[PDB]
Amino acid sequence: QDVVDLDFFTQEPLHLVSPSFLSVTIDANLATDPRFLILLGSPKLRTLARGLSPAYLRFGGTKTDFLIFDPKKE
Amino acid sequence: KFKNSTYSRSSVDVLYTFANCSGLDLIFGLNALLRTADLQWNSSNAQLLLDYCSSKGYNISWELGNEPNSFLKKADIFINGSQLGEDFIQLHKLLRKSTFKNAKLYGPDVGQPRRKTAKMLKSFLKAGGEVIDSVTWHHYYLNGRTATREDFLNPDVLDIFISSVQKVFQVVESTRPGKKVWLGETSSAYGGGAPLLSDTFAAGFMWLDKLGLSARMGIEVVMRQVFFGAGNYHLVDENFDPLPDYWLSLLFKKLVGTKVLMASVQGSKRRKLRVYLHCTNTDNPRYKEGDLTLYAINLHNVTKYLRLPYPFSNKQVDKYLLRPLGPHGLLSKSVQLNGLTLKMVDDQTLPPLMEKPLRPGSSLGLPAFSYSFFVIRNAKVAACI
Ligand SMILES: O=C(O)[C@H]1O[C@@H](O[C@H]2[C@H](O)[C@@H](NS(=O)(=O)O)[C@@H](O[C@H]3[C@H](O)[C@@H](O)[C@H](Oc4ccc([N+](=O)[O-])cc4)O[C@@H]3C(=O)O)O[C@@H]2CO)[C@H](O)[C@@H](O)[C@@H]1O
Ligand SMILES: [Cl-]
């Protein structure tokens, strides 16, 4: 048959995840895209990101170790 | 191949305002390959960025380096885990002297724990483990260039994740017992993702299973590569359209709570019917304290019917079944929730996520090659209050 019995353990939490358990990244690579300001200014994209709040947004990736802050570049 | 690039105050502002306006907590990866004469980390660029972020009152968390296990291949520079821990101790001193004294520090963002990576992680946690808030590591199942449709549906590929998690916890328990462990960057396939796979309904089996296993096995936070970007593994494409994994992520967020429980299928054989159980998310207005959220993956090519155990057999269950919108089947970029296509109402409004109430006592139907959430109403589980 295609009928399957489940067993559940419900006596106590086995772990506690963060409220931000499901988090997301933006790849460091995207900061080198000329349209970086257009892209992340998008009100549609902010609406989508708000849906996954609360969450961490990690900015990183291979390019992390090939990016230098320049306070003059404006 | 990788060349140095610069980023401006403008870029930092774009990124922070995106996160602040979105209710997201920004973690910023600092450059670890800026080295003094004797391969010490040179903190001078990071000092310029900390001061600028402080001067704007930006509440930012930090990391230092990405996949240091690969720095030899990427930059012909070898930094051992000892030296990296020392570099983290120096970043910790800079944060403690900054305007945000309690700012958090995560690392070391190692790749999945092969022998040399596990050795680097151990020596890192011996040296610098006292100053990190959580241990970060990365996981991808497949190379995007060679991955097949079959790979995305194969329980033997899904199961490899279990041995990576166990190996990371073996290193952490041997060095910094109790330290939280995060997946700092994860997805289906590296090399930018598998074309026509990593951005489709088919990608959801790996994503939901990874969330289910990570939660069950003790991982506190999972960071999805990527929310937005060039790679096929994006949640949102460059035309700002959400992909199936976005809608799966949104449902997970709304329904799945912080308290992790366990489900298993009788007759064992945990291969193609994968089941996970948490308390329901207390922020979901629809549900109440004590409710359960079951989520399940069916990788069989036939429908399976799940029977809930006593004392949950006769409870009202709300079904949230995701199926692709045709004609592209599992390779579709569109998804239906209980037969309704998921689409934004407009640029400012996510749709409501409408449940299907099942007949109480009915078995939970899970079609072939599908995944579903099930909320058990009035479950009255004391663990979940
Ligand atoms: O021209 C192109 O577009 C080239 O794409 C490359 O893939 C990119 C990704 O597109 C990019 N991600 S993004 O789209 O969101 O910007 C970025 O992804 C990396 C990530 O930065 C890094 O941390 C990660 O590193 C590893 C290392 C090892 C393993 N492993 O299990 O062995 C996994 C992951 O890898 C991500 C990834 O590969 O997706 O950068 C990559 C690489 O530049 C393709 O590599 C090129 O073929 C395209 O020409
Ligand atoms: Cl510690």
Domain that holds residue A30: 1-74
- Of B154, B233, B240, nearest to B197 by C-alpha is B233
- Tell how far the Cα of B44 is from the centroid of ligand 2, in angstroms: 27
Which has the closest alpha carbon to B277: B177, B169, B375? B375
What is the length of chain A?
A: 74
Q: Whole-angstrom Cα distance, residue B140 to residue B132? A: 23
Q: SS3 of B30, please? A: strand
Query: Distance from first CA to last CA of chain B, Å, rounded?
Result: 54
Which CATH number belongs to the domain containing residue B55 in this structure?
Answer: 3.20.20.80
* Beta carbons of A5 and B265 less than 8 Å apart: yes
Give the closest-approach CA distance of B327 to chain A in angstroms: 25
* 8 Å CB contact between B369 and B324: no
Put residue B57 in one of left, alpha, beta given phi > 0 → left and psi -120 to 50 → alpha.
left
Among residues A8, A13, A2, A1, the alpha carbon closest in space to that of B310 is found at A8
Amino acid, res. B181: V
Beta strands in A1-74 (DSSP E): 3-9, 15-16, 22-27, 55-60, 67-69
Answer whether B363's CB lies under 8 Å from A1's CB: no
- Tell me how long chain B is: 385
Q: Do the beta carbons of residue B267 and residue A10 sit within 8 Å? A: no
Which bound ligand lies closest to the C-alpha atom of B178? Answer: 2
Residues B48 and B169 sit within 8 Å (Cβ to Cβ): no
DSSP per position, B139-193: EEEEETTT--HHHHT-HHHHTHHHHHHHHHHHHHHTTSTT--EEEEEEEEEESS-
Q: By C-alpha distance, which of B150, B133, B132 is closest to B141?
A: B150
Diameter of chain B measured on Cα atoms:
71
Nearest by Cα to B224 from B243, B249, B205, B247: B249
B224 in Cβ contact with B215 (< 8 Å): no
Q: Which two tokens stand for residue B154?
A: 């194969």
Compute the distance between CA of residue B12 and CA of residue B229 in angstroms, rounded to an integer: 17
The position carrying tokens 């569109």 is B334
User: Is A2 in Cβ contact with B15 (below 8 Å)?
Assistant: no
For residue A40, what are the CA distances in angstroms to B12, B53, B74, B310, B341?
A: 11, 19, 28, 49, 26
Helix axes B203-217, B160-173, angle to 10 degrees: 30
∠ CA B76-B79-B80, rounded to 5°: 135
Q: Give the burial class of B98: count Cβ atoms within 10 A of its Cβ; 0-12 exposed, 13-18 middle, 19 or more buried.
A: middle
Buried residues in B288-301 as b, exposed as e (16+ CB within 10 A)? eebbbbbbbbbbbe
Which residue range(s) make up the domain with B235? 9-260
Structural tokens at position A8:
């559940």
